[PDB]
Each structure stands twice: as C-alpha cells, then as structure tokens.
Automatic annotation (TrEMBL), chain A:
The keyword Transmembrane applies. Disulfide bonds join C42-C260, C54-C66, C87-C129, C264-C288. Its main location: host cell. Homotrimer of disulfide-linked HA1-HA2. This is Hemagglutinin. The lineage of its organism: Viruses, Riboviria, Orthornavirae, Negarnaviricota, Polyploviricotina. GO terms for biological process: clathrin-dependent endocytosis of virus by host cell; fusion of virus membrane with host endosome membrane; fusion of virus membrane with host plasma membrane; virion attachment to host cell. The chain holds residues 15 to 323 of 548 of the full protein. The keyword Zinc does not apply. It is a single-pass type I membrane protein. Keywords: Clathrin- and caveolin-independent endocytosis of virus by host, Clathrin-mediated endocytosis of virus by host, Disulfide bond, Fusion of virus membrane with host endosomal membrane, Fusion of virus membrane with host membrane, Glycoprotein, Hemagglutinin, Host cell membrane, Host membrane, Host-virus interaction, Lipoprotein, Membrane, Palmitate, Transmembrane, Transmembrane helix, Viral attachment to host cell, Viral envelope protein, Viral penetration into host cytoplasm, Virion, Virus endocytosis by host, Virus entry into host cell. The gene is HA. It comes from Influenza A virus (A/chicken/New Jersey/Sg-00421/2004(H7N2)).
Automatic annotation (TrEMBL), chain C:
Its main location: host cell. The gene is HA. The chain holds residues 14 to 323 of 548 of the full protein. Glycans are attached at N29. GO terms for cellular component: host cell plasma membrane; viral envelope. This is Hemagglutinin. Disulfide bonds join C43-C261, C55-C67, C88-C130, C265-C289. It comes from Influenza A virus (A/chicken/New Jersey/Sg-00421/2004(H7N2)).
From TrEMBL, chain E:
Belongs to the influenza viruses hemagglutinin family. Binds to sialic acid-containing receptors on the cell surface, bringing about the attachment of the virus particle to the cell. This attachment induces virion internalization either through clathrin-dependent endocytosis or through clathrin- and caveolin-independent pathway. Plays a major role in the determination of host range restriction and virulence. Class I viral fusion protein. Responsible for penetration of the virus into the cell cytoplasm by mediating the fusion of the membrane of the endocytosed virus particle with the endosomal membrane. Binds to sialic acid-containing receptors on the cell surface, bringing about the attachment of the virus particle to the cell. This attachment induces virion internalization of about two third of the virus particles through clathrin-dependent endocytosis and about one third through a clathrin- and caveolin-independent pathway. Plays a major role in the determination of host range restriction and virulence. Class I viral fusion protein. Glycans are attached at N82. The chain holds residues 332 to 502 of 552 of the full protein. It comes from the Viruses. Disulfide bonds join C144-C148. This is Hemagglutinin. Homotrimer of disulfide-linked HA1-HA2. Palmitoylated. In natural infection, inactive HA is matured into HA1 and HA2 outside the cell by one or more trypsin-like, arginine-specific endoprotease secreted by the bronchial epithelial cells. One identified protease that may be involved in this process is secreted in lungs by club cells. It is found in: Host apical cell membrane; Virion membrane.
Amino acid sequence: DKICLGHHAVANGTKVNTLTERGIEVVNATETVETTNIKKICTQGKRPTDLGQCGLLGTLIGPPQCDQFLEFSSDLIIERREGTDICYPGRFTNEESLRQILRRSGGIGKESMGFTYSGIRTNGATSACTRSGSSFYAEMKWLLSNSDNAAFPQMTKAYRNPRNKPALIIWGVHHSESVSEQTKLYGSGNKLITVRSSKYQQSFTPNPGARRIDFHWLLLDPNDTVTFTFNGAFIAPDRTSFFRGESLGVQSDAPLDSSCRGDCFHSGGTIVSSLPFQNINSRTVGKCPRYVKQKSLLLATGMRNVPEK
Amino acid sequence: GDKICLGHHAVANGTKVNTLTERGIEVVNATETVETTNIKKICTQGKRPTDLGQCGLLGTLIGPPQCDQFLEFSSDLIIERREGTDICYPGRFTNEESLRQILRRSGGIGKESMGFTYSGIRTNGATSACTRSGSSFYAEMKWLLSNSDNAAFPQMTKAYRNPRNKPALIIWGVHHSESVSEQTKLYGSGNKLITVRSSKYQQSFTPNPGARRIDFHWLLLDPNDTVTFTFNGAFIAPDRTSFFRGESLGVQSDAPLDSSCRGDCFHSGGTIVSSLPFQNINSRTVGKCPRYVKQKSLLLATGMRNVPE
Amino acid sequence: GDKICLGHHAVANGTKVNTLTERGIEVVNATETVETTNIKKICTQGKRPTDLGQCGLLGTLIGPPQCDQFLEFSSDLIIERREGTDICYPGRFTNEESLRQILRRSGGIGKESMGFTYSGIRTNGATSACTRSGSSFYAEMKWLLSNSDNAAFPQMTKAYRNPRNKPALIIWGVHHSESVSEQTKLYGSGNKLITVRSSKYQQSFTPNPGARRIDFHWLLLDPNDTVTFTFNGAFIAPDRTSFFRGESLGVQSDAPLDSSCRGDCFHSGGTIVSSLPFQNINSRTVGKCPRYVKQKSLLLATGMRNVPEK
Amino acid sequence: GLFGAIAGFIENGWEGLINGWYGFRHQNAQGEGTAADYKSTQSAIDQITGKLNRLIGKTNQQFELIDNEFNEIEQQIGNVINWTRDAMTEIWSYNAELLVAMENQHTIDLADSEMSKLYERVKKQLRENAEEDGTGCFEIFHKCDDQCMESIRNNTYDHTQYRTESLQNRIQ
Amino acid sequence: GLFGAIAGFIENGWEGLINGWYGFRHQNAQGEGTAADYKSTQSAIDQITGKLNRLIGKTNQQFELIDNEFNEIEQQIGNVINWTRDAMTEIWSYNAELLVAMENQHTIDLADSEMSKLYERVKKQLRENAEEDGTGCFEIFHKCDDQCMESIRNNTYDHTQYRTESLQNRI
Amino acid sequence: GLFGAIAGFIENGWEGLINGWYGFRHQNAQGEGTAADYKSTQSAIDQITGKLNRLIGKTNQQFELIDNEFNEIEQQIGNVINWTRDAMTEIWSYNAELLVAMENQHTIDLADSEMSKLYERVKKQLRENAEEDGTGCFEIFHKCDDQCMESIRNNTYDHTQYRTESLQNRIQIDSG
Ligand SMILES: CC(=O)N[C@@H]1[C@@H](O)[C@H](O[C@@H]2O[C@H](CO)[C@H](O)[C@H](O[C@]3(C(=O)O)C[C@H](O)[C@@H](NC(C)=O)[C@H]([C@H](O)[C@H](O)CO)O3)[C@H]2O)[C@@H](CO)O[C@H]1O
Ligand SMILES: CC(=O)N[C@@H]1[C@@H](O)[C@H](O[C@@H]2O[C@H](CO)[C@H](O)[C@H](O[C@]3(C(=O)O)C[C@H](O)[C@@H](NC(C)=O)[C@H]([C@H](O)[C@H](O)CO)O3)[C@H]2O)[C@@H](CO)O[C@H]1O
Ligand SMILES: *[C@@H]1O[C@H](CO)[C@@H](O[C@@H]2O[C@H](CO)[C@@H](O)[C@H](O)[C@H]2NC(C)=O)[C@H](O)[C@H]1NC(C)=O
Ligand SMILES: *[C@@H]1O[C@H](CO)[C@@H](O[C@@H]2O[C@H](CO)[C@@H](O)[C@H](O)[C@H]2NC(C)=O)[C@H](O)[C@H]1NC(C)=O
Ligand SMILES: *[C@@H]1O[C@H](CO)[C@@H](O)[C@H](O)[C@H]1NC(C)=O
Ligand SMILES: *[C@@H]1O[C@H](CO)[C@@H](O)[C@H](O)[C@H]1NC(C)=O
Ligand SMILES: *[C@@H]1O[C@H](CO)[C@@H](O)[C@H](O)[C@H]1NC(C)=O
Ligand SMILES: *[C@@H]1O[C@H](CO)[C@@H](O)[C@H](O)[C@H]1NC(C)=O
C-alpha cells in the first residue's frame, strides 16, 4: 500500500518567458498587453463636442464655419482634420499653446467687453469670410476710417475683468495688401498697436505686401485691466472668453459612439482595458495603460506544466 | 517525554505591509521609504545664501534701485521671491528665462567697468520711474542723448575687449520713445540704428517709437574677443559688465531662510531633509532630492511575518 | 565505515559582486554588464561614410565653396567636424538644429533644378566672402538685384511644384544690407517684403539692414504641392532643391575614420563596440547603443557563492 | 523550480486531477483513487490572485496632447517630444518585459514551493509508518484502507495506531 | 512563506521571545525553558540591514530649475516639461511600488528560510535520537537534562552518547 | 543562501573539483575518490546561460543626437534637454543597479537550490541504509565498494540489495 503526491497538468499548456528560460510551458497565463482597439470615440457619460469643419481656435474669433461653436460646453473636445481657425488669411501667434489651453478648458463662455465707437467705421467685411454676403469674424470688429484715405484718430479702449476667473483676450493686426492699401483703410504713415496689462506689454506694427489678419492673445487676471492703444490696422474684440471647467481634448478621425464608455482616447478611437500595458498607439490622451513595443507579454497564472507521456 | 521545540519571535501588534502576493500582510517591523515630513524653511546652514527679495535676478545686471545691494554678490544658493522685479522703467529682457538659468548657477556676479567715456553728448539720462533720492536710472547703465533738445546725436563707435579668463556678460538697451517727436527731442531727427557685434554675435536694432520702453539685450563675450557697439541714438549703454564667480543653485520659494537647518533639496514650500529614497512632498524640486512618488506611504519590511500568540 | 559526501566547486580567489542583501560577496565567476572600452576612431567598415571636414552639414544645401565636394552626396554614416562651417557670407539658418537633425538621417542628398528663369533683373549677385575662382556665391542659390544702382526691383512671383515622389527641401535667403542706402542701391528705395507660401507653410520676411548678412529659411514641400515666392527685393533665390536618398546616421566627432573596425554605436569620442546592456562611456550617442548609466561597473554573477577551502 | 518537486523528483503532472492544483493518489487492496488537496491549492491560487490584483485594474494618471497631428508644431520642440516619448517607450517596454519575466520565475517557484510543503507535511504526519520512495510516493508499511487513506488526506491520521505493525514490516 | 516554516508548520511566533528572532523552547523533568539562537538571528538581521544600506542614505543627482513659478514661461515648452515631469512621476511611482513589494516578498521568505535552516540543523544534529512532532518540535527519546538541552542549542550534543537509550525507547 | 547548503551545512567548496559545479566525495576501503555530477551542474549552467541570453547580445535601442557638441543650442530648450537626459540616466542607472542586484541574489540562491536538490536526491536513494552526519555526508551502514559508490552517483543504486546489512549496523539493540 502507498500514497503518492502530485499535481495537475494539461495536454496543451501556454508558453511564457522567465528570468532563466524562454518559452517554458505553464498551466495557464493571462495577457498583460492590450491589443483590442475600439474604432470609435466612446462618448457615453460625457458631453462631447465634435468641432467638425470648425477649428478649435476659430471658436474664439468666429469665422462662418465656427458660427455653431461660439459658446460650447463639453468635457470631451474632438478636433477633426477638416477644421480651420480662419477665413481671411492669417494665423495665431503661439497657436498650439492656445489650443492646449482650450482643449482642457471645459468649453468657452463669451461675454461682451462693451466697446463703443464714434468718428470711425466698425462695419469692415471681406469676401473670404462669406456669411449671407460679405462679413467678418463674429466676435471681432474691423475698424476703418470714415472714408478712403481719412485719418484714423489715436484711440484708447480698456477692459477690466469683472468675473472671478481669467479672461481670454484676442485682437487682430491687419497687414494690408500694399503700401497704399493701408492709407486707404486707415491714416497715413506709421501705425502702432500697444496692448497693456499688469503683466503683459507688446507693441505691433503692420507689414504690408501680403494681405492677412494675424491674431494675438493674452490671459487677463480678475480685477485687472487690458489697455488697447491704436491708430489703425487694428481688429478689435467685441466679446471675450471665460472657461467653464474641465475637459479632455482629442484629435481623431473616429466616429462618436454614445453607447460605449471610455476614458482613454487616441486618433484611432478608444482603448477600454483593465490591463497595465497596450500596443495600440504610442500617442494617447486621458487615463491610459502605458504603451509598450511588445505585442504580447504573458503573465503566468499557473504552475510549470509537466504533461503525462 | 522530553522535547525541544523550535520557533520564532512575534509581537501582538505588528505592521501591515504589501508584497507581490498580498496586500496588508502583518510583519514584525517596517520602516518608511516615502518622506512626507517637510520643513517650511529654506535651510541655509553650511551655505552662502542670497535672498534677492524685492530684487529680480536679472535686475542684478542692470541695477534698478531694488537691486542696488545685489549689484555684486557671492552665493552658492540664490533665492528668488514672488515680489522680485527686474526693471524700473517699462521694458523686458530678450530671452529672459535663458539668462535667469545661467545666472542661477553662476555662483554670483562680479562687476567690472568697460571703460566707455563719451564726448559731445549728455550721459545723465534719468527717469522718475527709477527713483533714488530723486530721478535716477539703471546703476550699471548710461542713458545717452544729445546735448540739448533736437540736437543731432553724433555717430559713435564703442568697443570693449574681454581681458578675462572667463566669458563677460554684455548688456545694452534700446530706448523706444513715446512718440517720433520725443525721439527727435532726445536724439537727432532721422533713422536711428544700433549694431552690436562680436565674433559670434551680429544683430542690428532700430527703435520703435510709440511704445515708451527700454528693452535689454545680451551676449556672452569670449576671452580676448571684442564687442563693438555702433549707434547714433536711442542707445542705453553699459558702464559695467558681469563675470560669474563659480557654482550655485537657484531656488524659487516663499519660505523664510533658516541658518539652523541643513539641506540639499529645495522647493516652493521649503526644504526636504531626508535619507529616504522617495518623497511625496513636491513634484517640483531643485538640488539633490529623493525621487517624487505619488504614494503617501510605502512601508519596507524589516522583520519576519508576524504571527501573534 | 564507508561514507559519501556531497559538495560543490570553489576557487582560491573569486569575484566580488553585489546582491539585494549583501555588498561585495564573493562568487565563483561574474561578468561585466557595463561597457567602458571605447575605440578612439569612427569605425566605418561595411559602411559608406562621409567625412564633411571643412564643410558644414547645412552648407551641403546652399553650397559655399567649402561644400563644393558635397553638393550631392550619398551616405549611411555622416561625420560632422568641429571646423565645419555652413556659410561664407555672414548669416545663419533659422531652425538650424532641427534641419541638421533631418539631414543627419537623410541618407544623403540629390539636387534638382527648380527651373526659375528671370527677366528684367540681374541674376549674377556675387561676394568676395564666397571666393571660388574670383567672387562667387552659394552654388545652389541666386542673388537677385536691380538692373543698376538704385533702380526699382519689380514685384515678382515664382512658383515651384514638387514633381517627385518624396518631400522637397526648399531653401531661400533674406539679404540684410549694411545700411538703408545699400538696400536702396541694390534693390531700389522703399520697403521690402518677401512672402513664402505652400499649402502647409506661410511666412513673411522683411529685411533688417545694419550689418551685412544673408539669413536662410526652409520648409519641406509635399509631393505635388507648390511653393510660391513673392518679393520686391532683398531675396536670395533657390536654383536647386534637395531630395533625400534613404537612411543614415550623423555623428559629431573629431575621431579619425577607421575602415578596419565595424560598429553601430557612435559618439564624439569614437565608436562603442559592445554586446553589453549598459555603457559608461558617453551619454550622447547615435545608432544602436547600450543605455547610458553612471556606474563604472556592474558585475553579474555567473556562478555560485565562493567558499574557498581551509 | 527552486524547490525540486514540480518538474523534479515528481516525474510529471496528473491530467486527471481536474479537481485542484495538488493532490493524493493512493493504492491499496481496494484499488487506486485520486483526491485534491484544497488547502495547498487555495494557497497557490490566492497568491496568483494577489499578483493579478496588483497588475490588473490600476488607476492610471491623465495625460494630455502635447503635439498636433493636423498642424505640425515647431520643429525643435517636436523633436524633443519625439525623443522623450520614444525614450519613455523604451523604459516602459523594458519594465514590462522584466516584470513579467521576474513574476513568472517567482510564480513557478511559488507553485513548486506549495508542492514541496504538502509533500513534507505528509512525511511529518506519517512519522515512522512510511518510507519515501523518491518519486513523491510514500510506501505505507501497514495496511491502510479507504478510511485510513482518508485520514492521511484529512490530516487526522494517528500514527500511534499503526506504529507497531509498521515497525515490524520495516525491520523484517 | 516559500519555506513553509514561519506561518506554516510552526503555528505561531513567541511573544515571550524578547531575546532574539529565532529560538528553542524545551520541556523536561525541570520545566520549560526559552533561549535565542544567535547565528540565525544575526543572519536575518544582517540581511535586512543589507537592504537598508541599499535604499537609505543614497547620494542623488542634482537637478536644476527648468521652469518658472513667478514668471510663466512659454506654454509650448511648459506643457512639455509638465508632461515629462508627470511621466517621471508615473515611472518612479511604479518603480517604488514594485521595489517595496518585491523586497517585502523576499524579506518574508528570507526570514522563513532561516527558521527552516535552524530546524533542519537541529534535525540532523539529533540523528536517530528524536522524532518530528509536525509542529516544529522534536520528541526526544532519552532523558535530556538542562545541560543536555544546552548541548543541542550550542551544537555540542553527541548523539552516540544517547543512541542505545533512544532506539530502545522508540520500539 | 536561501537553501542552507552552499555556505551552510556544507562547510566549504572543493577547489579540486574542476570537472563540474557539484560533486561526490566518497571514502571506502579502497580509498578516496571525487567525481562531478553532470545533471545538476548543467541545470545550474543552463539557468545562468538563460540569464546571459536575456542581457547579453540583445538588440540595442536606437539613438539620435538632439544636442550640438560644437555650437551650443539656445539655453532654455538646451536646459530642458539636459534635464530630461539626466532623468533618463537616473532611471537607467537605477534599473541597471537593481536588475543586477536582484539577479545576483537569485543566481546565488539558484545555485544553492541545485546543491540541495542533489543532496535530497541522494538522501532518497539511500533510504534506510545511511544517515546524514550534518556536514553534507551520508554515513553508509554497509560495505560500499567503488562499484557501489558508482551506483549511487549514476542513480542505479538499489537499496534493497543492502538493507539487511544496513539495519543490522544501524539498529544496534535487541528487537523484541
Ligand atoms: C498731463 C501731462 O501731460 N502733463 C505734462 C507732463 O507730462 C510733463 O512732464 C514730462 O513730460 C515729458 C514729455 O516729453 C516726459 O515724459 C517727462 O518724463 C521724464 C521721466 O520719465 O521722468 C523726465 C526725464 O527727465 C526724461 N528723461 C530724459 C529726458 O532723459 C524722461 C524721458 O524723456 C522719457 O521717459 C522718454 O520716453 O521723461 C515728464 O516728466 C510736463 C513737462 O515738464 O508738462 C506737463 O504738463
Ligand atoms: C576702407 C574703405 O572704405 N574701403 C572701400 C570699400 O568699402 C569698397 O569696397 C566695396 O565695399 C562695398 C560696400 O560698400 C562692398 O562690400 C564691395 O564688395 C561686395 C562683396 O564682395 O561683398 C562686392 C559685390 O559685388 C557686392 N555684391 C552685389 C552688388 O551683388 C557686395 C554687396 O553689395 C554687399 O555685400 C551687400 O551687403 O559687396 C566692396 O568691393 C571700395 C569700392 O570698391 O572702396 C574702398 O575704398
Ligand atoms: C485561465 O486564465 C484565463 C485568463 O486568461 C481565464 O479566462 C477567463 O475565464 C473566465 C471564466 O472563468 C471569464 O469570465 C473571463 O472572461 C476569462 N478571461 C479571459 C481574459 O479570457 C480562465 O478561466 C483560466 N482557465 C482555467 C482553467 O483556470
Ligand atoms: C548641457 O550639458 C552639457 C554637458 O553635459 C553642456 O555642454 C558642454 O559641456 C562641456 C563640458 O561640460 C562644456 O565645456 C561646454 O561649455 C558645453 N558646451 C559645448 C558646446 O560643448 C551644455 O552647456 C548644457 N546645456 C545648457 C543649455 O546649459
Ligand atoms: C523597527 O523599525 C522602527 C521604525 O522604523 C524603529 O523605530 C524601531 O526602533 C525598529 N526596531 C524595533 C525592535 O521595533
Ligand atoms: C568566467 O567568466 C568569464 C567572463 O567573465 C568567461 O570568459 C568564462 O567562460 C567563465 N568561466 C571560467 C571557468 O573562467
Ligand atoms: C515626430 O513624430 C511624429 C509621429 O511619428 C511625426 O509625424 C513628426 O513628423 C515628428 N516630428 C519631428 C519634428 O520630427
Ligand atoms: C504646469 O504645472 C504647473 C503646476 O504644477 C502650472 O501652474 C502650470 O500652469 C503648468 N504649465 C502649463 C504650460 O500649463
């Protein structure tokens, strides 16, 4: 009579790697590298904004494409390939810095700064920004002289931030098509725009030759003041932006789906996984497993498999 | 019958630690590896500190009244304060942060005269923005201007060779007047042009009237190399240049100095004094520090598994 | 009576190693995991190296006299030297460092004529700073100026479409004259503007006279996309553009070339040849390299505890 | 593994032990039978569960976009980002592979340990009534029926009951 | 415990053993008695001290300020730094958690090992003069006075002296 | 070591065992003799070699210069680069130090393990014919000549052959 001690085994085990061996066979193993991607932006539980044709920075100044997005409220901002920020030629200085602030802003609320004018025009429009005829950036005012070649008077417009959170101030510098184009719209000779606050100063000159309106910006503190001084070539803000709360910015070609929940996103969709690592995309956003180069990393969950012969 | 029994010690009240296999398993003893105990002071024992206070670090080069007592200084620990300012007359440094970085590790600055003397002009430019028992200017600089209102400022050349074993920090200013007529008043009428040239640096400056500011620019001049200044107005000239003393650490804090504690790891809210490998106090630190972790506590076992009676 | 004993080997003097619990414990054998043996040469065996010498890597695009032998070149290992210079006439490339990085891995360059012809202006702008059989200029560039002193340089437009299967490296220059007068002499009086536009790039340039210089700017032009130059003076025009060949490494080093050793990890002090996981030689490396560590030695035990006889 | 049982002195595993990780295989006058040991098996599973609780379902920290797919950022920052990210990837790839390799080495040794412990428990239980044959079996030197075999697995085996008989058989 | 002694076949520790880490407890004609074993205790302490030397009092790398708390640096560069810093936090937090977990696993197994080694030492020492309880005790089949018990403790016990007596008590 | 054999109950190594890692030293009427054990030696080597395969000869990671060693780049981005690099150096130095330390612990214990395994294996072979002296030897209680010694080494020793002689020498009392 005898009693024998032993342990279980299966016919087909799983090969894993250890410190001393390669492809040693164990009873069972679990994958630690996620490789199943959801080819959608999972928007369940969220309040998403799909910008579509509208560029994220366009929401601030309002070209026709972004008329639908002047005030948005979301926790998940989806940027699309076909989005443009401008209509009339030009670009934002530090454009990516501004995008990065916007993507996590929670959306933007617009508020009228309350600038009024006399002795000048405010009805500046262009055929590039078409919106039932010729118009302009919805949040911006194009300032001219009363007629062709008239003198633009030295002006001072100031705005104090009433709210208890910072205000995003935007303004534009119109670079004319030619030397005499500048004198036709505004006064003769040298033009200068000065923008001041308690912690920002910068001056601006127009450079004629290639028509464009370039946009510049600052963040004005609560109870602080922005001072604009200008004698022409100045695109004035009509409204400013106040951030709402928290959001996550995504760049993607993936469709939104409000029937799946997710927290990690990339250009190719959503990653839903409890696993520590992923081989799906090295560029991700949100709360994600860490990217690895390996396709699979099997963690042993059973003993060394020694089958019967 | 006689017997001998083998066993181990235990306490009734052990410490719970984590293993690879188990959470909150009780061991006899354990010691912390994450430092959480802060000292709300900048520990300066054994060190030579400089508390810049109202003086901004860059101010030490040009010399507004706030920085008179730090025109020359020797330190191994430079402390910056929120209330520190670099300027008295409105204006900014070019690449301000780059300069701040080389100065923080300079070991302090020693000043030397550049030997610039002038003829046929005024040297005593001053402003109510820089007060020092009346209207004054930057201590290390000279505001050059014509002999009287609207007089022609003579075309000048001023050259300085670095006669030293180490690089000289050369500074100069461009004065942008409030208006064209003001520029005509202080200097001559006509195009104003300033060129700065070493064997590694070449850059020309034209003033931009309308702004009302003095902007500073800088270069490092190699031993035996020569900086040549060419100007006919709007030029804020150096009287002195800077030389670095050795090695130092820069610290940004609102914490008072304390000569009675010793430390080599500093941050916004004080000093971390520890032998522990990790710290959960501040993610942003300077000097020789434990590595930041997001855990409050990671207990390392220093005893066996505890199994009470 | 009789007995059998079980035991293990030892040596008289073993090798000290470190463990989790002990420092300098002696094992039978151990091996180094941290490379400290440097070869004071650039090992170029089985490679097509390019020793740029006097010629700066960026110079290969615009072509100062020192880069004549490198205007077109084919390499898998580009060696930059301390004495290398990108320019003859004073100036610098904007974004020079990121362009250097692109060129280092380019596999070399091929040149193609952009086919710009000109009417009503002069094309033969030269300088004695770029001497090459008299007063010459950048070999891939053209210094454009008025027909005579002070004459008005006409407003002009030049367009080039990438006709290839790969990106075109477009280069242009802005001439900053010694003075207002000199700008007027070369290009006529009045202000000057240069505008460069592709479907991805859009920048304007005005010359800032005061000290003689030509500053260079660049973009990558996508296949089938067009670059458009508009200018009324102070413009240094491209004649040729560049196309990359494939794959390469770029080293900055003064180490001599050696075609008798093979290597895939390079740095300023030469070549690192190792099969070890770590190295303490240099933290700035190019190629396939062990990871830099600050420790001089990390001995890995390849044997049991050493217990010598008594 | 480190403990010499699984893939050691015990030749191979039993595919017919579907009831647990470890077990007993008796042989007497009534025939052979196999039963799984709960205590040793649960101990092993709990430890592997421990590993899973650590690695699976962690709370990851948030990261934002720092570059742009639709509008290339300035070349200098872009290159630094690319250099940083790839270096992170290399570290994380290294960490992941090492983690798995190290954990697996420990897991196998852990399973081997639990086998060794169980074997040793039986040995100390059987006292002088049995000799180990070196293949993981215990030659019982008395007669041990199904209830007796039970009492060994159950850990209720009284060695005094069978000692005199077994000592006579061991010596003869 | 990988070695199955501590929290294994030894039911529990001894709170009365303030002497050391491991020890012996004996019963005879003179009563109970507890004593510590120096060799094993010192072996375990020495190893734990070894871990502490590796982790505590380390020299660190100097890091400078690349950031500005009082003057906001360009957001482009700022966001890159913040990204890098956070990524470092993620890496060191992992390293630290894993280091401590791995070390603690080992420390427990290491201590358990020492107990087993001491128990096995005693087993081989006692030869055919004792039998195993199963609870960590050795049932001694001869009369072993306080001097005899100490001989077992300080490794001078001669099994030959008691063998005849033991074997006949074992039948 | 974790297993108490090497640097444990076995006093010291044998400097004369050049033919392997683990061995047998016997004493009988014919004299002394030492022989290597192949199975145990190769198991320890295979495991060490396994470690070397993981660390030596690996495909290295790719590297590119972001600095300029001839002409210093702008200070700010230059300082960011240095900061990031030094942080990488910190991480990899830690990794390397720890990896090697952790491996060396396992390596020493692994080798100790194999010594214990070979010891226990022999113990099981001899059954009731031998006792452990506590120094790593087995006192054999029957005449074991050079061939008998050989059979223990190559695992063909049949304990049944020697049991009766052994028990007579082991149990040296009267059995009633
Ligand atoms: C309400 C009102 O306009 N009141 C004026 C008052 O402004 C004016 O005072 C002076 O005005 C002149 C204008 O040219 C300057 O602005 C003077 O400013 C000073 C200064 O900053 O302290 C005086 C100083 O001596 C000057 N430095 C020189 C000449 O080297 C500087 C300097 O010119 C500017 O800073 C350059 O931008 O300006 C200011 O005191 C008086 C006339 O005295 O008349 C009132 O009605
Ligand atoms: C000490 C002294 O006064 N010597 C003068 C001397 O300046 C002058 O020589 C000429 O000076 C002019 C500048 O006024 C140029 O530098 C001339 O050289 C070149 C050059 O090689 O760089 C010649 C070249 O033909 C020019 N290229 C053109 C027109 O496309 C350039 C070009 O104009 C400038 O570089 C643009 O910034 O300049 C140089 O010969 C002589 C008069 O010949 O008189 C001495 O007394
Ligand atoms: C082997 O491990 C796998 C995990 O890879 C286990 O598979 C899980 O099985 C449960 C049901 O018991 C399911 O709810 C899960 O969805 C499965 N997970 C995965 C990732 O597939 C499996 O149970 C294990 N097998 C055995 C025999 O224990
Ligand atoms: C980043 O650090 C490197 C060195 O690690 C610095 O580069 C050079 O360092 C050497 C030797 O330490 C010095 O002699 C030189 O002055 C440095 N420059 C060059 C071109 O070799 C570098 O200065 C550091 N970067 C910054 C921005 O401070
Ligand atoms: C164990 O560690 C603790 C905390 O680190 C320490 O205070 C104590 O003195 C140590 N020793 C004992 C016996 O508790
Ligand atoms: C010892 O290690 C070295 C490398 O460090 C190796 O060449 C050799 O194979 C090893 N063995 C012996 C017996 O020297
Ligand atoms: C960095 O990598 C991304 C993704 O691979 C690529 O699109 C981009 O061109 C790279 N940027 C630079 C500056 O090299
Ligand atoms: C980086 O983080 C700090 C707080 O740690 C924050 O104040 C700062 O605004 C951040 N930088 C950017 C560019 O968002």
